[PDB]
């Protein structure tokens, strides 16, 4: 409806090259009445 929601989880690993076999359930971090349209994302990285 315009309200943008981010849910997320942080967890320890020791894995070389694939996503970990197991289960997780993302907690709601942040929720905002932003009203914008979103149609394309890109990530932001350090150099």
């Amino acid at each position: 409806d315009g309200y943008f929601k981010i849910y997320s989880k942080h967890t320890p690993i020791n894995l070389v090259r694939d996503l970990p076999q197991g289960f997780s359930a993302l907690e709601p971090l942040v929720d905002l009445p932003i009203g914008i349209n979103i149609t394309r994302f890109q990530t932001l990285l350090a150099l």
């Binding site: 409806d1 315009g2 309200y3 009445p33 932003i34 009203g35």
Partner: protein, 48 residues
């Protein structure tokens, strides 16, 4: 030719009408994006 601006004279001796008045509008609009600024939802002492 005129420069488009001039000073308000404002001195304490001035009468009602002339004296400087300090002004704002609470200027706003409604319902084209989700709400965000709204009055105080009054809350009342809890009971059990």
């Amino acid at each position: 030719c005129y420069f488009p601006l001039q000073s308000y004279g404002f001195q304490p001796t001035y009468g009602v009408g002339y004296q400087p008045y300090r002004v704002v509008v609470l200027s706003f609009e409604l319902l084209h994006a989700p709400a965000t600024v709204c009055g105080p939802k009054k809350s009342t002492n809890l009971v059990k």
